[PDB]
Amino acid sequence: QWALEDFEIGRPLGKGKFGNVYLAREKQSKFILALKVLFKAQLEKAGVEHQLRREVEIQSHLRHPNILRLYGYFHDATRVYLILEYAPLGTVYRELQKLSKFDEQRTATYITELANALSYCHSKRVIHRDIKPENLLLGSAGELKIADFGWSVHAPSSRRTTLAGTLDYLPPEMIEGRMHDEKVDLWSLGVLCYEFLVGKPPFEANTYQETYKRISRVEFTFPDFVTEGARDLISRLLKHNPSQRPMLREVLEHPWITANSS
Protein backbone atom coordinates (compact mmCIF):
# COMPACT_ATOMS: atom_id res chain seq x y z
CA GLN A 1 0.00 0.00 0.00
CA TRP A 2 1.25 3.45 1.06
CA ALA A 3 4.45 5.10 -0.13
CA LEU A 4 5.82 8.62 0.33
CA GLU A 5 4.86 9.38 -3.27
CA ASP A 6 1.15 9.19 -2.34
CA PHE A 7 1.44 12.42 -0.34
CA GLU A 8 1.98 16.13 -0.79
CA ILE A 9 4.11 17.52 2.07
CA GLY A 10 3.69 20.91 3.75
CA ARG A 11 5.37 22.60 6.73
CA PRO A 12 6.67 20.74 9.80
CA LEU A 13 4.14 21.06 12.61
CA GLY A 14 6.76 20.05 15.18
CA LYS A 15 9.99 18.16 15.81
CA GLY A 16 11.16 15.60 18.35
CA LYS A 17 14.13 13.42 19.26
CA PHE A 18 12.98 10.76 16.84
CA GLY A 19 11.69 12.87 13.95
CA ASN A 20 9.18 15.42 12.71
CA VAL A 21 5.46 15.73 12.09
CA TYR A 22 4.43 17.35 8.78
CA LEU A 23 1.18 18.67 7.48
CA ALA A 24 0.48 16.36 4.55
CA ARG A 25 -2.18 15.68 1.91
CA GLU A 26 -3.03 12.35 0.32
CA LYS A 27 -2.80 13.07 -3.40
CA GLN A 28 -5.98 11.38 -4.63
CA SER A 29 -8.53 12.42 -2.00
CA LYS A 30 -6.85 15.76 -1.09
CA PHE A 31 -7.48 14.67 2.53
CA ILE A 32 -5.22 16.52 5.00
CA LEU A 33 -3.42 14.40 7.60
CA ALA A 34 -0.34 14.52 9.84
CA LEU A 35 2.61 12.51 8.53
CA LYS A 36 4.89 11.57 11.42
CA VAL A 37 8.36 10.63 10.18
CA LEU A 38 10.73 8.82 12.54
CA PHE A 39 14.35 8.18 11.61
CA LYS A 40 15.48 4.58 11.93
CA ALA A 41 18.94 5.73 13.03
CA GLN A 42 17.45 7.58 16.01
CA LEU A 43 15.14 4.70 16.89
CA GLU A 44 18.05 2.23 16.79
CA LYS A 45 20.38 4.53 18.73
CA ALA A 46 17.81 4.69 21.55
CA GLY A 47 16.87 1.00 21.36
CA VAL A 48 13.15 1.69 20.91
CA GLU A 49 12.69 0.00 17.52
CA HIS A 50 10.92 -2.90 19.24
CA GLN A 51 8.73 -0.55 21.29
CA LEU A 52 7.45 1.21 18.17
CA ARG A 53 6.49 -2.10 16.48
CA ARG A 54 4.52 -3.05 19.60
CA GLU A 55 2.87 0.35 19.91
CA VAL A 56 1.95 0.53 16.20
CA GLU A 57 0.00 -2.73 16.53
CA ILE A 58 -1.75 -1.40 19.67
CA GLN A 59 -2.55 2.00 18.15
CA SER A 60 -3.94 0.26 15.07
CA HIS A 61 -6.74 -1.27 17.13
CA LEU A 62 -7.52 1.80 19.25
CA ARG A 63 -10.65 3.53 17.94
CA HIS A 64 -12.15 6.24 20.14
CA PRO A 65 -13.39 9.78 19.41
CA ASN A 66 -10.87 11.11 21.98
CA ILE A 67 -7.79 9.18 20.78
CA LEU A 68 -5.88 10.31 17.69
CA ARG A 69 -6.29 7.66 15.04
CA LEU A 70 -3.45 5.95 13.23
CA TYR A 71 -4.61 5.47 9.64
CA GLY A 72 -1.66 3.41 8.41
CA TYR A 73 2.09 3.25 8.24
CA PHE A 74 5.01 2.35 5.98
CA HIS A 75 8.79 2.57 5.85
CA ASP A 76 11.75 3.02 3.56
CA ALA A 77 15.46 2.40 4.12
CA THR A 78 15.91 5.23 6.63
CA ARG A 79 12.48 6.26 7.93
CA VAL A 80 9.25 4.99 9.46
CA TYR A 81 6.13 6.92 8.37
CA LEU A 82 3.03 7.08 10.57
CA ILE A 83 -0.12 8.36 8.83
CA LEU A 84 -2.01 10.12 11.62
CA GLU A 85 -5.29 11.97 11.99
CA TYR A 86 -4.68 15.71 11.74
CA ALA A 87 -6.14 17.66 14.65
CA PRO A 88 -6.67 21.17 13.19
CA LEU A 89 -6.79 23.27 16.39
CA GLY A 90 -3.32 22.41 17.76
CA THR A 91 -2.36 21.34 21.27
CA VAL A 92 -4.20 22.00 24.51
CA TYR A 93 -0.83 23.31 25.76
CA ARG A 94 -0.90 26.11 23.19
CA GLU A 95 -4.51 26.93 24.06
CA LEU A 96 -3.36 27.20 27.70
CA GLN A 97 -0.54 29.54 26.59
CA LYS A 98 -3.20 31.73 24.96
CA LEU A 99 -5.86 31.69 27.69
CA SER A 100 -3.38 31.52 30.65
CA LYS A 101 -5.82 29.23 32.49
CA PHE A 102 -9.12 27.47 31.88
CA ASP A 103 -12.43 28.05 33.61
CA GLU A 104 -14.14 25.23 35.51
CA GLN A 105 -16.56 24.34 32.71
CA ARG A 106 -13.79 23.93 30.13
CA THR A 107 -11.59 22.01 32.58
CA ALA A 108 -14.38 19.65 33.71
CA THR A 109 -15.42 18.98 30.11
CA TYR A 110 -11.85 18.11 29.11
CA ILE A 111 -11.31 15.89 32.14
CA THR A 112 -14.56 14.08 31.23
CA GLU A 113 -13.35 13.37 27.67
CA LEU A 114 -9.96 12.16 28.88
CA ALA A 115 -11.42 9.93 31.60
CA ASN A 116 -13.66 8.31 28.98
CA ALA A 117 -10.67 7.85 26.66
CA LEU A 118 -8.56 6.34 29.45
CA SER A 119 -11.37 4.01 30.50
CA TYR A 120 -11.43 2.70 26.93
CA CYS A 121 -7.63 2.31 26.97
CA HIS A 122 -7.68 0.38 30.26
CA SER A 123 -10.37 -1.94 28.86
CA LYS A 124 -7.77 -2.82 26.20
CA ARG A 125 -5.04 -3.28 28.83
CA VAL A 126 -3.43 -0.06 27.49
CA ILE A 127 -2.06 2.06 30.35
CA HIS A 128 0.19 5.07 30.99
CA ARG A 129 -0.63 7.44 28.18
CA ASP A 130 1.55 10.56 28.52
CA ILE A 131 -1.32 13.04 28.69
CA LYS A 132 0.72 16.15 29.36
CA PRO A 133 -1.06 19.01 27.50
CA GLU A 134 1.48 19.02 24.65
CA ASN A 135 0.26 15.48 23.81
CA LEU A 136 -3.42 16.47 23.86
CA LEU A 137 -4.84 17.87 20.63
CA LEU A 138 -8.02 19.67 19.63
CA GLY A 139 -10.14 18.30 16.79
CA SER A 140 -12.14 20.54 14.47
CA ALA A 141 -15.12 20.43 16.88
CA GLY A 142 -12.81 21.21 19.80
CA GLU A 143 -12.82 17.65 21.13
CA LEU A 144 -9.71 16.46 22.94
CA LYS A 145 -7.53 13.80 21.31
CA ILE A 146 -4.94 11.79 23.21
CA ALA A 147 -1.94 11.88 20.85
CA ASP A 148 1.14 10.65 22.70
CA PHE A 149 1.74 7.85 20.16
CA GLY A 150 5.12 7.94 18.45
CA TRP A 151 6.71 10.01 21.28
CA SER A 152 6.68 13.74 22.06
CA VAL A 153 7.16 16.48 19.50
CA HIS A 154 7.44 20.23 20.10
CA ALA A 155 5.77 22.94 18.08
CA PRO A 156 7.87 26.07 17.47
CA SER A 157 5.55 28.04 19.78
CA SER A 158 6.44 25.71 22.68
CA ARG A 159 8.50 26.84 25.68
CA ARG A 160 8.67 23.45 27.46
CA THR A 161 11.02 20.73 26.30
CA THR A 162 10.01 17.10 25.58
CA LEU A 163 11.74 15.94 28.69
CA ALA A 164 10.54 18.60 31.10
CA GLY A 165 6.85 18.27 30.26
CA THR A 166 6.96 14.49 30.55
CA LEU A 167 8.72 14.76 33.90
CA ASP A 168 6.08 17.17 35.21
CA TYR A 169 3.46 14.40 34.83
CA LEU A 170 5.32 11.35 36.20
CA PRO A 171 3.70 9.71 39.25
CA PRO A 172 5.63 9.17 42.50
CA GLU A 173 5.75 5.40 41.99
CA MET A 174 7.64 5.77 38.72
CA ILE A 175 9.86 8.52 40.13
CA GLU A 176 10.65 6.18 43.05
CA GLY A 177 11.23 3.14 40.80
CA ARG A 178 8.42 0.98 42.25
CA MET A 179 5.85 -1.22 40.54
CA HIS A 180 3.04 0.73 38.95
CA ASP A 181 -0.39 -0.07 37.52
CA GLU A 182 -3.20 1.77 35.70
CA LYS A 183 -3.48 4.19 38.63
CA VAL A 184 -0.62 6.13 36.96
CA ASP A 185 -3.29 7.52 34.62
CA LEU A 186 -5.39 8.75 37.53
CA TRP A 187 -2.36 10.64 38.84
CA SER A 188 -1.79 12.26 35.43
CA LEU A 189 -5.44 13.36 35.40
CA GLY A 190 -4.87 15.17 38.69
CA VAL A 191 -1.78 16.96 37.42
CA LEU A 192 -3.68 17.97 34.28
CA CYS A 193 -6.76 19.22 36.13
CA TYR A 194 -4.47 21.40 38.26
CA GLU A 195 -2.46 22.76 35.32
CA PHE A 196 -5.76 23.50 33.49
CA LEU A 197 -7.19 25.52 36.38
CA VAL A 198 -3.95 27.14 37.53
CA GLY A 199 -1.92 27.57 34.33
CA LYS A 200 1.18 25.81 35.73
CA PRO A 201 1.81 22.18 36.71
CA PRO A 202 1.67 21.54 40.46
CA PHE A 203 5.21 20.19 41.08
CA GLU A 204 7.08 22.66 38.86
CA ALA A 205 10.54 23.49 40.25
CA ASN A 206 13.74 25.13 39.04
CA THR A 207 15.68 21.86 38.68
CA TYR A 208 14.71 18.34 37.67
CA GLN A 209 16.06 17.02 40.97
CA GLU A 210 13.80 19.38 42.93
CA THR A 211 10.84 18.35 40.77
CA TYR A 212 11.56 14.70 41.66
CA LYS A 213 11.41 15.52 45.36
CA ARG A 214 8.22 17.59 44.99
CA ILE A 215 6.48 14.75 43.13
CA SER A 216 7.69 12.06 45.51
CA ARG A 217 6.59 14.07 48.58
CA VAL A 218 3.40 15.30 46.82
CA GLU A 219 4.31 18.91 47.64
CA PHE A 220 1.67 21.06 45.97
CA THR A 221 -0.50 23.96 47.15
CA PHE A 222 -3.58 25.67 45.64
CA PRO A 223 -3.97 29.33 44.65
CA ASP A 224 -6.84 31.10 46.41
CA PHE A 225 -9.19 30.92 43.38
CA VAL A 226 -9.30 27.11 43.12
CA THR A 227 -12.77 26.14 44.34
CA GLU A 228 -13.35 23.61 47.07
CA GLY A 229 -14.84 21.09 44.64
CA ALA A 230 -11.78 21.33 42.37
CA ARG A 231 -9.49 21.00 45.38
CA ASP A 232 -11.34 17.84 46.42
CA LEU A 233 -11.00 16.10 43.03
CA ILE A 234 -7.37 17.11 42.57
CA SER A 235 -6.48 16.03 46.12
CA ARG A 236 -8.06 12.60 45.60
CA LEU A 237 -6.21 12.06 42.32
CA LEU A 238 -2.81 13.24 43.60
CA LYS A 239 -2.57 10.70 46.43
CA HIS A 240 0.87 9.19 46.92
CA ASN A 241 -0.73 5.76 47.49
CA PRO A 242 -2.12 4.62 44.11
CA SER A 243 -4.78 2.49 45.83
CA GLN A 244 -6.22 5.67 47.36
CA ARG A 245 -6.83 7.25 43.96
CA PRO A 246 -10.39 7.03 42.60
CA MET A 247 -11.66 4.81 39.84
CA LEU A 248 -12.17 6.56 36.49
CA ARG A 249 -15.94 6.05 36.87
CA GLU A 250 -15.66 7.83 40.22
CA VAL A 251 -13.97 10.79 38.51
CA LEU A 252 -16.76 10.91 35.95
CA GLU A 253 -19.37 11.01 38.75
CA HIS A 254 -17.52 13.45 41.02
CA PRO A 255 -19.89 16.30 42.02
CA TRP A 256 -17.53 19.00 40.73
CA ILE A 257 -17.29 17.24 37.35
CA THR A 258 -21.04 16.73 37.01
CA ALA A 259 -21.81 20.30 38.09
CA ASN A 260 -19.44 21.89 35.55
CA SER A 261 -18.89 19.59 32.60
CA SER A 262 -20.50 19.90 29.18
Residue 188's closest CA among 178, 162, 180? 180
12/158 Cα distance (integer angstroms): 14
| Closest separation in Å from C-beta 148 to ligand OGR | 6
Residue 68's closest CA among 120, 135, 7? 135
Stretch that binds ligand OGR, among 49-57, 111-119, 143-151, 251-259 (CB under 6 A): 143-151
Q: Which of residues 94-123 bind ligand OGR (CB under 6 A)?
A: 94
| Closest separation in Å from C-beta 66 to ligand OGR | 14
- Closest to ligand OGR by CB, 21 or 121: 21
Residues 6+ apart with CB under 8 A from 83: 2, 33, 35, 70, 71, 72, 73, 74
What residue is closest to ligand OGR based on CB? 14
- Closest to ligand OGR by CB, 21 or 96: 21
| Closest separation in Å from C-beta 161 to ligand OGR | 13
85-116 burial, b if ≥16 CB within 10 A, otherwise e? bbbeebbbbbbbbeeeebebebbbbbbbbbbb
- Closest to ligand OGR by CB, 35 or 189: 35
| Interface residues toward ligand OGR, by CB under 6 A | 13-14, 21, 34, 36, 84, 86-88, 90-91, 94, 135, 137, 147-148, 150, 152-153, 155, 157
